[PDB]
Scaffold this active site. Structure first.
Site, PDB file in Angstrom:
ATOM      1  N   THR A  49      55.555  91.613  63.224  1.00  0.00           N
ATOM      2  CA  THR A  49      54.928  90.405  63.735  1.00  0.00           C
ATOM      3  C   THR A  49      53.569  90.640  64.366  1.00  0.00           C
ATOM      4  O   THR A  49      53.302  91.697  64.973  1.00  0.00           O
ATOM      5  CB  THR A  49      55.779  89.752  64.810  1.00  0.00           C
ATOM      6  N   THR A  50      52.697  89.651  64.196  1.00  0.00           N
ATOM      7  CA  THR A  50      51.401  89.690  64.841  1.00  0.00           C
ATOM      8  C   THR A  50      50.996  88.269  65.170  1.00  0.00           C
ATOM      9  O   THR A  50      51.047  87.377  64.332  1.00  0.00           O
ATOM     10  CB  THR A  50      50.296  90.353  64.002  1.00  0.00           C
TER      11      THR A  50
END
Lengths: 214, 222, 215, 213, 214, 216, 222, 229, 222
Positions: free
Chosen positions: I1-2
């Site tokens: 995730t970012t």
């Protein structure tokens, strides 16, 4: 009105005890003798408390049976926490005194009861029997020869007062006791704290065996 | 530590050493390990000092508390049970290094035969108690040496005097084999303490009496 | 009516105390002396509290025995939490004062009792005996020579008020007390002293032939 | 009948305080002087609360001794939780006010007592003594020169207002105190001595008691 | 009866507050001004609650001091749980209203007190001062210019009603405040919420400084 | 007289509600409209409860603000526990009914309040608005067109009873309301609506020049 | 750390060093470790600083709390018991690194003989206490060194002055062998602190007197 | 992190760096670690950021809470005690990786001598406190470096400005040897923060004076480096 | 995730990827990680999905709950504090694998200057917060990549759209290096989501714009 309530509660109690059957306990040569007017086959007004300690009561059954149980509870707990021989009739009377005193004070209704705690010597020991009378308000007093509770006492008290003589035989004593009651077997509950039993003094004298005494 | 107790006709004597240790170091030379618990009872405790002292102090208070409350003293059996309860209560801590074991000595006033009224009760870490029937008992790191000594010397205990003398010799034997038990200190004048109990009650033995016995034993072995 | 309620309460307690047997405590040369009219062998009105502290009461037994036990509880606890010598008659009187005060205020019925806490000096020590009286409402007062409680006190108080001598012998003291008491035997008297001469526990009962004798 | 109860309880309290012996506290050059009518060998109506805070009371002993203990409890706890110098009389008085207020309201019987909390300056410090009076209902007020409690106050007081001088010394004020008292070993006397390093409180008893008179 | 209770409870609170000294709070160009008749150096009727919120009360000290502490408790807890700027005079007034409402209803005795909560703008911010009055019954109401509490208010109210000058000078208000107060310096407790202060607005005007404005 | 007491109790509450300012809520083409007599700068008698649920009250402020808070508490807890869509005006009215009923019964003093819970349809649903009135004793009832609470209601009720128009516009409804309120200006009124046209949070206050424009 | 205490005819003296450490790092140079607990008592605590300070502070408050409440000071035995209870109550935390051991010194006003009224009480981590009978005692990482030093110097103790001197020299010997104990700092002028107690009460010893003793000890050893 | 505090005549100065780290990674460049607790107090906290920040915030509220409640500020000793209690209370969490150590600086308005009224108090993880008598103290991963630097520079402290300078130079010295401490950032214009306290109260030092001081130290350091080997 | 956030003149943009993983396995392709919390706030959460979603949901309810109760929104600082408290409360759970880290973006209507009213706040696992002063921030397994990308691209942000493009390119760079972050999926038409906030409030960015930007970024890299 701390004074009116005190009087009413006290009256309410005395009345209940008055309308109840009578019970008598007296010292005698072999122990202590318990004799009560009791029609019922399975309901007992006389009971064992501990090794050498007996219990007798007059008044409302559910209320005195409650006290009987509590007494047994107290005795067994003491004996276990310390030793059996540390339990005494004096301690039980003292406990009942404190208990009834509290009930009489803080409970909705006073207990319509009158109790008697008795103790005889330990086997082979030599000691004068002890009798204690605790009343609905927590008052306590030890009688030297006999105790009477329930219904009209004076008539039974006086009859016994003139009748009694310590060191009497079981039978002479049983008779004197019944007669005093008469003033005020299928209708009698009889038991003794027998000083000659090795540990548990309490013993019921029922049926034929009772007949012979009578 | 070594605490000994022996029965003699008509009574008991209990005696303890004075040493305290922190590993190999001597940390005390005058500790009193035998306490008069009530008029007819004495307690000697071995193990963790903090716990031992607390036990003796609490125990005596509990015994007197009952007496004042009930107007009479607890029966000897009751006394044993109370002590046993206290020991049992400390089991968790004992497992963690706070172990303390008491030795109870007393004269039972209600016993039928007075010359036989002396009582000696030992306790294990779980509170298990045992009324000694063979005459003597001991507790502490030197207890085996003391007991083995008393086994050979007990026949000599014919009265409270020879009993006190034997007790002292047992403690002496204990210190002779257990570095954690202190022997008589002649240079500083410190000796084991002792309590004697008979029909007239529990009494502390005069230090001068113990010192005399101690010096005689030393002269003997010399 | 709160003013009225307080009055009824005091009245009830007074009546109970009045209808009860009398008790007397007085200073003497060897300590303090407790004498009570008591038929019973087993039920006591006089008791030990701590090392040099004594207790005496008059009124309803179950109520003052209750206070007696509480007192012993308090003393033993303090001595244990601190040291024996930190327990004093003054502390006990103070405690009873506060206790009775609370009962008299928040309990259903006031306690029909009157208490006396006494203390003598420690062995070999030199101190004047102390006597305290705590009434049913929590009022406390220390008497210098004697205390009287239960039943009709004035008669007994006055009788003693004249009879009293400091440093009287035990026999003399016993006599003033018995005599003072009737003015208002052994099988009817409970006797005990705080004997200042005793090394630790001062309290001791004088009973049987020993008592008879002193009479 | 909230209004009736309020009156009765209040009356019950005032009466009890009235039938009790009188106590007086006055500011003198040396700090605060406490003088109370008290025959007892063993019962005190005057006590130390904290380093420079004193306590005096009139009424039912068991009740004000109760308050005295609670005050000591409060002070010791605060001083420990913060610092000694954070404990003040204004604070102890405030607490008593709230306490009696609660008793007067929710307890079976009101406390038949009247209290006085006094405070002097810290050693070497320069501050005017403070006196507080808390009454059975929780009312509080600080007097600038003296406080009187117990029994019939006005005779003692009124006597005091003319009798009072500022900076009157222990002896002079002390007599004025005794005089308003009348308006030796049957009296309790103590002072918070501003001249002592920490514990200001100290009792003046025995022979020294007659000397100052 | 339930009407008798309310009637009776309400009268007691009023009587208590009536026999107490008077306090006044009013808006001025620089903030709010608090002025109360107080002969005591050490016992305070006016106090800081939070950054821009002030407190003033009349009645039984121990009771409003109690409320004052609870207010400070509430404010400090809210500011910590959220942010300082989330605490407002309206919230505090609301809380007091609910608190007194409850006391008046379920407590033995009503609180003989009358409170005022005031709030000024944050530094450099521009907002009209707010004044709230909460009664012993929890009644709440915000006055636009001034609030009066304790003793006989009408006289003081009317006297002030006459002279109010919105945006008056500090000295003007002080001067005006004393007269209204008088019609009903070593005996005055004076303090203001100074909108000009950067964080903590509350500040007491005492001694020579106070004298100066008289 | 437990009943008699329960009589006074009830008068005690009614007389507080009586002596209080009046509030009116009405259905209209755009949602529900809330209009109350309110001089206060900052004390509110009308509030948002949930997405499409509004609240209005009359009586003792501290007491109905208490109920308002409890209402918000109940709604938010329910929405989170289940889903937002699961919260309805009916649930809130039901809760207030039970709450006041309990207060009226076991509390020292009854709450001198009268409440109104209103619901508009969610965005796009065609649903007629619901207005519920809960009284100091826990009685509940749903009005089809309007609700009036506080002070002398009859005058205001009748006045409204006569000019009521369904499907009525915001300006029309506002004036109609303000009139009936007179029967029994901006500086003196608190106005807000549950605007069914709003996507999620229907509630919105009409204040200042805008309220001014509407009164115009 | 090293804290010493000794008995002299008519009294007691207690002195402590001023060092504080964090491992091998010196973290304190002037920590005061000896406190006047009440008019006749002084406490010196070794171990974890945070706990040591808390102990002394709380202990003094508890003693004075009793005095105000009961109108009279606690007996010396009561004081000992209170301190022991406090230590025992820290046993769990101490097992975890929060160990603090106190040393108690006092003058018993109620004791029969004034020359012998001085009291020295040591404590172990379990709260076990011991009234020292040999004249001196010490606590802390340098205590063995100090005690061995006092053992050979004690016979020179005849009054408070020779007592205080033996105390400072004992602290000096402790610092000489225990890096965790701070010796006299002549460059900064920091010296051990000390309290003397006699019939007239507990009094802080003036730094200048200790400075003189320290310097003399140093010139002597030089 | 490095937070320093020193006593100068009539006052005390406390200054801290701006770095924040997650292992080796620099996670913050502008963290403010010195807080004005009350008008005469300042707190600087090292260790776990989340805890450090909570401490300063709570402590300030507690000090002001007392003041409002009691009408008077807590005594300096009371302030010390309250902070020590807070640290002790976090001892279990601290062992679990949530350690925060504060450094306290203040001016005691009630002390006897106003030129010496400055106060510096250090705390250990167990809440043990100590009032410093040598004029300076430091806390954080660069504290040993900062103290050894101050030891040699303290005799130059003759007033608030020279004290501020020495403090900044001590922080510089800490950053020079401790990668967890941030030195002055000339490219971004970020510098240590500082609070000064004297009889007139606690004040935040203006960035501009700190920025000038820092450039001056750097220039001096360059010159001296070139002069030597 | 970012999840990334940045500041553009007069506003803020926050954008997140759509991937979900269970070890190496891709378990989600269309997860929405950026939520509009209130009219002027947006939250993006990384870490354990279950916890991340609960946080966003609870947080928004708690912000609106304050508003309805107090009639006014919480100040921006209060919003920060509430979120920090929530994170701190999950610390124990986080150590057991239930870690969730949020990233906060908002527009402070009460700030002084409107062009600088944008706010970005990052949080660590203990709840420590930091108001970002350098223009951008990121959270999640690809955050370092995204941040190093934004560092080089930030100078191009001059308005809402250019900011949005930099955000999308940062996410693209994150997916390029972190297998746990999902790049734009052309086959399925799934793209990062984004929220834009300015004086007019928080608005969801239309999928179509992100897709155009995505394609241009891809084209440009080819």
């Amino acid at each position: 009105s701390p004074e009116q309530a005190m009087r009413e509660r006290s009256e309410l109690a005395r009345k209940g005890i008055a309308r109840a059957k009578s019970v008598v306990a007296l010292a005698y040569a072999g122990g202590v003798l318990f004799v009560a007017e009791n029609p019922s086959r399975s309901l007992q007004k006389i009971s064992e408390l501990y090794d050498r300690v007996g219990f007798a009561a007059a008044g409302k059954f559910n209320e005195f049976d409650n006290l009987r149980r509590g007494g047994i509870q107290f005795a067994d707990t003491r004996g276990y926490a310390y030793d059996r021989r540390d339990v005494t009739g004096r301690q039980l009377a003292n406990v009942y005194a404190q208990t009834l005193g509290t009930i009489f004070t803080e409970q909705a209704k006073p207990y319509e009861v009158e109790l008697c705690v008795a103790e005889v010597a330990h086997y082979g020991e030599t000691k004068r029997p002890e009798l204690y009378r605790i009343t609905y308000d927590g008052s306590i007093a030890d009688e030297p020869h006999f105790v009477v509770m329930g219904g009209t006492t004076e008539p039974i008290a006086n009859a016994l007062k003139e009748s009694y003589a310590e060191n009497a035989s079981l039978t002479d004593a049983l008779r004197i006791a019944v007669a005093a009651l008469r003033a005020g077997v299928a209708s009698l509950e009889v038991a003794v704290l027998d000083a000659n039993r090795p540990r548990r003094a309490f013993r019921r004298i029922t049926g034929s065996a009772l007949q012979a005494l009578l | 530590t070594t605490i000994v107790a022996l029965k003699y006709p008509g009574g008991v004597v209990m005696a303890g050493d004075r040493r305290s240790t922190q590993g190999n170091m001597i940390s005390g030379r005058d500790v009193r390990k035998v306490y008069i618990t009530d008029d007819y009872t004495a307690t000697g405790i071995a193990g963790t000092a903090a716990v031992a002292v607390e036990f003796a102090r609490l125990y005596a208070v509990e015994l007197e508390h009952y007496e004042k409350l009930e107007g009479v003293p607890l029966t000897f059996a009751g006394k044993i049970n109370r002590l046993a309860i206290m020991v049992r209560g400390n089991l968790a801590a004992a497992m963690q290094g706070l172990l303390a074991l008491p030795l109870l000595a007393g004269y039972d006033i209600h016993a039928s035969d007075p010359q036989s009224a002396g009582r000696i009760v030992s306790f294990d870490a779980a509170g298990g108690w045992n009324i000694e029937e063979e005459g003597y008992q001991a507790v502490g790191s030197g207890s085996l040496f003391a007991k083995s000594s008393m086994k050979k010397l007990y026949s000599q205990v014919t009265d409270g005097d020879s009993g006190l003398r034997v007790a002292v010799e047992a403690l002496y034997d204990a210190a002779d084999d257990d570095s954690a038990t202190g022997g008589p200190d002649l240079v500083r004048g410190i000796f084991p303490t002792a309590v004697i109990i008979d029909a007239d009650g529990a009494v502390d033995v005069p230090e001068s009496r113990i010192a005399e016995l101690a010096r005689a034993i030393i002269e003997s072995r010399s």
